[PDB]
Every structure is written in structure tokens, then in C-alpha cells.
Design a protein around this ligand. Structure first.
Ligand code: FAD
Ligand code: FAD
Ligand code: AU
Ligand code: AU
Lengths: 485, 485
């Protein structure tokens, strides 16, 4: 019957925009609702969502700034006449990053206008079957109807339920647009975002302290996680183990001001205090699925975690509403997963395709000071799945050539592959800790999709001299116990 | 009967040393003869051969110096307060590189002593069946006998048959230990070494001119070759097309002196002159198989090219003499190929293995200012092999994130895959032109060994934001003619 649009995408993040562009490619009427509720402090950003504005992109750019710091240090030994110590200007770096983010926001808006996709800067909210309520910034309300709906609502940073967090602490949301140098900083948490931000804040010369609850990088391989922790610690970052903040109180306002954080042990009553210029909370992310009125349409969600269960076709229990992105239950919360799922969903709905999104063996990279690229099973998970006796772990240290002249950081980089003997020594796991990890990891992920075997990998000819070539000649097993130095 | 050693390896290059170490791993008596005939100028180097001393390693290090120059330039926009123009010191860079090369020479010598491998700094020469003559630096001669012989003699730079070349020009042999800044330089040739040296000499701020005979990078994909030429030309390198030097004459001696080069056109009698501080000859390499007495033992060689034909087991026409490395006929002249062939040959001879060296689809990287990584067939070769109508070329420009803030070099990087439709759109060719090319290329080479298909590649999930991810979403064909900007 009557239907304003054929597809309404709530949320203009990576996945949402990808699906919008693709569905528009097939002449369907599509409308995108994107609205960023401001941070407790008041920070807001444009179209594009978390990756573009507050995520993947600026984090990579600041990591590049840190890497260029290390390059400035390295250049001395290679013959460049650079002054011994170079200072870093936070304001300029922020200006450059924010300028590029603005350019990407504008690019996306132009792309949406070009593909004839209506963009409405309004907060979406279900009120009834096939109908939604959109509230603009000013407060004006409008109603829309659609045949199909795409929930692409994404997540927002989580806060500790402690006093002072919301008015005195900053999150990933605020850091990449912070209008002043954070000075000394306390990063709470051990998620990959926590280590990324800690690392590159340390690289630009600030004093950073990371406060962890139990373990580093839950979900990632713990051996590699421990190695990253060791390397970060040897670079000047300080770690306080087994502590959670219980109160944050402002000593003096400013830009930055001074704050006191009082925290309690996890296994005792021992209480320690510290003074920091700003405190960044990186302790996970919460789905924004509570406040979109899913009850008015009957979408079933996991009340405990907020995630929405979906079929292998991204379909909810309600036939005409589909969800993509991080909000999904037991999927992988990465931007290329969202984009691929959106593209394939659009092609399935309007292009007669049958290809589904494969969520298995998807690579990731943690951009710590020492990049960490991973694809496939962890060692622990592999042993769980196939049995200790059936898993052989080939590993080796290697020394990237570019670091020999600076004469630094030997026998730190680490490469290990986890192979299943029961299945022709198939390579079920791949982990690399070293420079340009993601570039090396992309190819071996594509190989894992092809069922790379240890024999073929051994037959592949390395390139010389390139870091990645360490993966050509892995011959030492952990089971053998031989040294790898 | 009587046999001094079980295996005599003539030549202590990459392949020779690899085979020596591996054969020693199995308790066999092995002796290595390594001797570097000095350059016309008189430059000599230690153990390790061409890659270690005058090749892969120092070329990568100087490329890293150029890359750090570009990083120094980039760092300004990211917020580092670096002086506008920084000067480069040739002498310090040479000192650092040569120090690392010395360390590698010492490492190899120690490794050989540890594995109980006799190293004799003597020039090898066959005099009769299973017997060889070794002449030390001083001139003393010794005789040796062996059950098996491994010719690993490698190649040496080729010179134009023009007057003045040998006493006034330098080769790749001399450059990486040159005791003075080369100043303005003329690089003759278009082999990958020519472009590598030109590029990084330009990066450190020198005025470089490349003089080519007909085409760039013969053997490599010509489209990518032309793109590299264009990019190098837009970076300040000057190209003189269709010219070959006919005389080099010294204007004034010095360090550097001044030389005049007079050269003639290739298609006319037009003659042009130029003045340069040094002239580097990079016009190919000639096998050192003439002067080792192969006639006294009956080893058949290709008289025209100097290469030695071999079986797929690296065996010559004489059963007990095997050859590895670049000297082989119609093989691939790369260090990992030599090392892999040596390792597999040793395991076949003394470890009962049957695994052979695979010379198909071996990757390479040309470290031009813009790295070029390749694996598999060129476009031209693919069309020749399978037929134009059966080849689809997916390609795209991409813009590495790290360059957006410096705001330079957009729509220059280029990624293309060549797929065979007759064979499930199999990926028969892979070419990437962009930063960290080799790291991206290693993985896709390993995938090609697994028979990666266009469908699987499309199903692989990219990593974000990484350059390599461009290979996840290739959808534009050259046949379609659509724009890629
Ligand atoms: C610091 C950081 C670094 C990261 N780095 C990486 C990385 O390197 N690689 C990687 O793969 N992933 C990375 N991620 C994860 C990545 O940001 C997310 O997984 C990804 O953005 C999920 O996409 P999405 O569209 O589902 O969520 P989003 O992109 O956040 O989409 C949600 C959008 O919809 C808006 N919205 C919310 N509620 C409503 C509503 N009711 N109505 C309308 N619009 C609404 C939101 O404001 C937002 O604009 C990082 C995340 C962070 C925080
Ligand atoms: C500038 C440059 C850059 C290069 N970059 C790369 C790169 O990035 N990647 C790559 O894969 N390849 C690269 N190569 C190619 C690589 O150097 C060769 O392919 C490789 O070294 C071949 O190994 P080989 O042992 O057969 O030759 P060599 O390593 O040269 O072995 C020969 C050794 O034996 C000695 N010898 C010679 N005659 C005798 C004799 N009669 N008796 C005893 N000893 C003798 C020689 O002096 C030398 O020490 C590069 C080459 C050059 C010139
Ligand atoms: Au600062
Ligand atoms: Au110079």
C-alpha cells in the first residue's frame, strides 16, 4: 500500500551508509536518519558515524603521528641532521585531523545527495508497525513509513557508575576533538581502544598511565596481549594492575585542570590515590538499542547485553526489520564487517543475490605502539576446539631490517601460526606482532579463506628483505621447546 | 674412495651459505669457497655475497633513508615542529650501512664456524673430475676433492663496451660504499636496480638523471612500469629517452670529480652531451661462469648467455655437480629463490626429502620511490597465455590514509588483479603500486599458491583502515571502461 520510502536506515554509520548507497544503486527509494546525541561534555560531530568521526580514522591518524615521532628519532642514525629532541603541538595535530574528518563528512553528504538518498538529521524512533518518528535538533517531529527498516544504530561509550565520571572524565568520543593538550592522563580499561589511545598518547611525549581491572585485551590471544603489555611498559607507559576507580574529584578547573582519582583494589581493600590532568574512560561500549522504541514494533532483543539476535541473513524476528553493525549478537564489531554486511544485505534484498556475509576468520589489528595483527583462532580457543595434542604452534622472533641502524627493539617482534595437525596441518590461526601488521595480515587472511596449509605456506617464496617473510620459514615449535632467540 | 669433503660449495652467497648450513645440519663434511674479485675501482667486501653486501640489504636501508626523508617532510602537517628544510649527510649514512653490513659478515662467519663448516677465502676453479684448485688472495694454491659440488657463483655488473667506463664509472658494486657524496649523478639503464638507486638518490636530495635505452623495467608489467616512470618523473628525476652512452671522459678529478658523457640517439644520429659528477652503470648482470674451468669437468652451459641449464632438481648434465642461484637458465634471480633452492637441494641430497623448489608465481618488489609489488603473470603475458577474451582486469586507484594530512599524491597508488574467467575467475596476476607494497604482496602470493579465486577474495573481509583493503572490493574492470578516479 502506501509507503513513503522503500528502505529506512536508522543510523548513518559505516554499515548504514553502505547499505543506503547500494540499495540506491538499484533505483529504490531510501532514507537515512542520522543523529548524534551529544557527549556529556557536549561534543558532537557530523555524518559518517563512529569509524569516520571518532574511531578508525582519527585513531589511525594519531597513531601515524606517533609513528612519525619514532621516525624522527630514527632518522638521526640514518644521516639526517635533526635536533636531538623535538616537541609536539597538540593543537595543530587536532586541527589537521578534524579538517580531514570534516572533509569526509562532506564527502559522505555529497555522495548521498548524488545517489538520490534523502538524508534527514533527525533522531529515529519506532512508534508502530512500519512507522517511525523523527525528531530534529530543534525539537520538531515528523512521521515516516517504510516497507523495510535497517537498524544500524551502533554503540556509545560506557561509563563507570562512580561519582564524577560524566562531568570530569572524557571518553574516546571527546579525545580526538579535545581543544587542549591532555597532559598527564589516566586511561581506564584494557580494551583495544584503551591500549591504542594510551600508546599514541605516550608516543607524542605525554605521561600516560593505564589502569586495568584483570587482564589485557580480553578476547584476543593472551600470549600476544601479554607481549604487547610488556612492550608498552618498556616504552614508558605505567601500568597499575587490578584496580578500578571509585571516585573522581576535581582539584582545579582548567584546560586541562587537575583531578584526583581514588581507586580500590580488586582482591583487597587497598586504596590508592593519584592526580591526573585528565581521565579517559575506555571500558567498553553499550548498544543504543534501548531508546528507539523497539517494543512498539515487537523486535526481540537480548535484555542483558542489549544486542539484537539476527538470522544469518541479518533478519530480526520481525520479517521486515533487519539489523547490521555492532548491535548484533555474537558477531564481530568491526567496520569492514558492517560495510560488507550492509552491501550484501542490499544486494540480497534488491539484486536477487544469495551470497551471505561470512563472519568467520575475520582479521583485526590493534594499533598499539607495536602493531598487532590477528586472523583466526587464538591459541587458547584453538586448543579448546581441536585438543592440545592436535595443535602445533610454530613461532619465531624476527628483527625488521629498518630497526637495525637505529639499533633498537631487537627480539621483540613475534610471529606465530597455529596449525591443526588433524587436518593436513591447516593454518587455523595467524598472529603477527611487528611493524605494518595489518598490511601483512590482510594477505594471510585471504589465504585462510582459501584453506592455506602449512606445506603450501612453506613452499611460498618469501620476498626479501621484508618483515612478512618471517612467515615463509617458520620451523620452530613451542612443543619442541627449542629457543627462538 | 678418497674425498676431502662431501660437498664443496663454490661461492658464499645467499644460496651457497644456505645450502652449506643445511648440509652441515646432517653431519656431512662441507667446505665453502668465497672470493670477491675486486671492482675495477678496487672495492671489495666480506663474506655473504651480493644480497648482504652490495644488494638487497643496503638498497633497502638507503630506501629507508629516503622514506625517512619523506617522513620528515610529512611530519610538519601532523604537528611536529621540524625546520622547513633538513640536509642529508652521505658520509654518516654510509658509515651506518657499512657497519651493519660488517655485522652481517661477522654473523655469517660465526654461523659457519659454529656448524663446523670450513670457510676458505679462496677463488675456486675446476681442474678435473671431482677436483678443484683454490687460490688465496696472496696467490698460494691448494687442491681439493669432493663427492659433490655446488656452483653458486652468482653474477657481476655488466659494463658498456665504451671508452672510460671502467675507470670513471661506478656500478651497484661501488655505490653503497662510496666514500664521498655522488652529487649530480647519471644512472644508465632501466633495470629494477637502476630505478631503485635513482629513486633513493633523488630522495636524499641529489640531482639524478636516468638514461634509458628503450623501455623501463623489461620483464615487468609495462603498464605498472610506465606508472612508476611517471611518478618518478613527477618527483624531480629527469628522464632521457632512447639514448645510450658512447663515451665518458674525465673533465676534472676529485671526490666527486666532473665527467662528460657523450651519448647517441637510438633511432637517429642525434648526439647529446652532459656533465655529471658521477655516472652509475646499471644495465644488467653477467654470470661468473666463464672463468671457473667448467670445461675441465664437462659442464655444459649456454654459451650465449652464460647461464647453466639444470634439471628441476638443480642438477647439471654432470651428475655430481649442481648449480643454484642466478646462474641458472630461465629461472628467477631473487635471493629467496636461491635460499629456498639451496635448502631444498640439501634436504634432497642428505635428508631423503622429495620436495622440489617451485619457481612459479614467485613475488618480487621493486623499491622505487613508490614501491611496486608483483606476483604472477603480467597483463601482457596473461593475455598471451589465456587469450584477451578470457582475461578480466580488475583495477582501482586508492588513497592511503597516511597521505591525506600531508595532502599529497592522491590517485597515484594503483592496485590491479588479473583474473582468468575460463578457470573460475582465478587470480593469475597481482600487482600493487603503493606504500609497503611487499608486505601486502607476501600474503597474496601465499594466497595464489592456494589458488585464490575472485569470489573468495571478494568474500574476504578487509581490515580498516589499511591500504591493502583495496584488494577486498575490486569491482571495476578495464573492459567496462568505467572511470576509476
Ligand atoms: C576509538 C575506536 C577505534 C576503533 N577502531 C577500529 C578499527 O581500527 N577497526 C575497526 O574495524 N573498528 C574499529 N572500531 C569499531 C568501529 O568504530 C565500529 O565497530 C563501527 O563503527 C560500527 O559501525 P556501526 O555503523 O554499526 O556503528 P556507528 O558507525 O556508530 O553507527 C551509528 C550511527 O547512528 C547514529 N545513531 C545512534 N542512535 C540513533 C538513532 N536513534 N537514530 C538515528 N541515528 C542514530 C550514531 O550517532 C552514529 O552516527 C573502533 C571504535 C572506536 C570507538
Ligand atoms: C643492487 C641490487 C639489489 C638487489 N635487490 C634484490 C632484492 O631486493 N630482492 C631480491 O630478491 N634480489 C635482489 N637482488 C638480486 C640478488 O642480489 C641476487 O639475485 C642474489 O644475490 C643471487 O644469489 P647468488 O648466491 O646466486 O649470487 P651471489 O650472492 O652473488 O653469490 C656469489 C658469491 O660467490 C663469489 N664468487 C664468485 N665467483 C667465485 C669463484 N670463482 N669462486 C668462489 N666464489 C666466487 C662472489 O664474489 C659472491 O660472493 C639485488 C641485486 C642487486 C645487484
Ligand atoms: Au602535549
Ligand atoms: Au649529498
Amino acid at each position: 500500500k502506501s509507503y513513503d520510502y522503500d528502505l529506512i536506515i536508522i543510523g548513518g554509520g559505516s554499515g548504514g551508509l553502505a547499505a543506503a548507497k547500494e540499495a540506491a544503486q538499484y533505483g529504490k527509494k531510501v532514507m537515512v536518519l542520522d543523529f548524534v546525541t551529544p557527549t556529556p561534555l557536549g561534543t558532537r560531530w557530523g555524518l559518517g558515524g563512529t569509524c569516520v568521526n571518532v574511531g578508525c580514522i582519527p585513531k589511525k591518524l594519531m597513531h601515524q603521528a606517533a609513528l612519525l615521532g619514532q621516525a624522527l628519532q630514527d632518522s638521526r642514525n640514518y644521516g639526517w641532521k635533526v635536533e636531538e629532541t623535538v616537541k609536539h603541538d597538540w593543537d595543530r595535530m587536532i586541527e589537521a585531523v578534524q579538517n580531514h574528518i570534516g572533509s569526509l563528512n562532506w564527502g559522505y553528504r555529497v555522495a548521498l545527495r548524488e545517489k538520490k538518498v534523502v538524508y534527514e538529521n533527525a533522531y529515529g524512533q519506532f512508534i508502530g508497525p512500519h512507522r517511525i518518528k523523527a525528531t530534529n535538533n530543534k525539537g520538531k517531529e515528523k512521521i515516516y513509513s517504510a516497507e523495510r527498516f535497517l537498524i544500524a544504530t551502533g554503540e556509545r561509550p560506557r561509563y563507570l557508575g562512580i561519582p564524577g565520571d560524566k562531568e570530569y572524565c572524557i571518553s574516546s568520543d571527546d579525545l580526538f576533538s579535545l581543544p587542549y593538550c591532555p597532559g598527564k592522563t589516566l586511561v581506564v580499561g584494557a580494551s583495544y581502544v584503551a591500549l591504542e589511545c594510551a600508546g599514541f598518547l605516550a608516543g607524542i611525549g605525554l605521561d600516560v598511565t593505564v589502569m586495568v581491572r584483570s587482564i589485557l585485551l580480553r578476547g584476543f590471544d593472551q600470549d600476544m596481549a601479554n607481549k604487547i603489555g610488556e612492550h608498552m611498559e618498556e616504552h614508558g607507559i605505567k601500568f597499575i594492575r587490578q584496580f578500578v576507580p571509585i571516585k573522581v574529584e576535581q582539584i582545579e578547573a582548567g584546560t586541562p585542570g587537575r583531578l584526583r582519582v581514588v581507586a580500590q583494589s580488586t582482591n583487597s581493600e587497598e586504596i590508592i590515590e593519584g592526580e591526573y590532568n585528565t581521565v579517559m574512560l575506555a571500558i567498553g561500549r553499550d548498544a543504543c538499542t534501548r531508546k528507539i522504541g523497539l517494543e512498539t514494533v515487537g523486535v526481540k532483543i537480548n535484555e542483558k547485553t542489549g544486542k539484537i539476535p539476527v538470522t544469518d541473513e541479518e533478519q530480526t524476528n520481525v520479517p521486515y526489520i533487519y539489523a547490521i553493525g555492532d548491535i548484533l549478537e555474537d558477531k564481530v564489531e568491526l567496520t569492514p564487517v558492517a560495510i560488507q554486511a550492509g552491501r550484501l544485505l542490499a544486494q540480497r534484498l534488491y539484486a536477487g543475490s544469495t551470497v551471505k556475509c561470512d563472519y568467520e576468520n575475520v582479521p583485526t589489528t590493534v594499533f598499539t605502539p607495536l602493531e598487532y595483527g590477528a586472523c583466526g583462532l587464538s591459541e587458547e580457543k584453538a586448543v579448546e576446539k581441536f585438543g592440545e595434542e592436535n595443535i602445533e604452534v610454530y613461532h619465531s622472533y624476527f628483527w625488521p631490517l629498518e630497526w637495525t641502524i637505529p639499533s633498537r627493539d631487537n627480539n621483540k617482534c613475534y610471529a606465530k601460526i597455529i596449525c591443526n595437525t588433524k587436518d593436513n596441518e591447516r593454518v587455523v590461526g595467524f598472529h603477527v606482532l611487528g611493524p605494518n601488521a595489518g598490511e601483512v595480515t590482510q594477505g594471510f587472511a585471504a589465504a585462510l579463506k582459501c584453506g592455506l596449509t602449512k606445506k603450501q605456506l612453506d613452499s611460498t617464496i618469501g620476498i626479501h628483505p621484508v618483515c612478512a617473510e618471517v612467515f615463509t620459514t617458520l620451523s620452530v615449535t613451542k612443543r619442541s621447546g627449542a629457543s627462538i632467540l
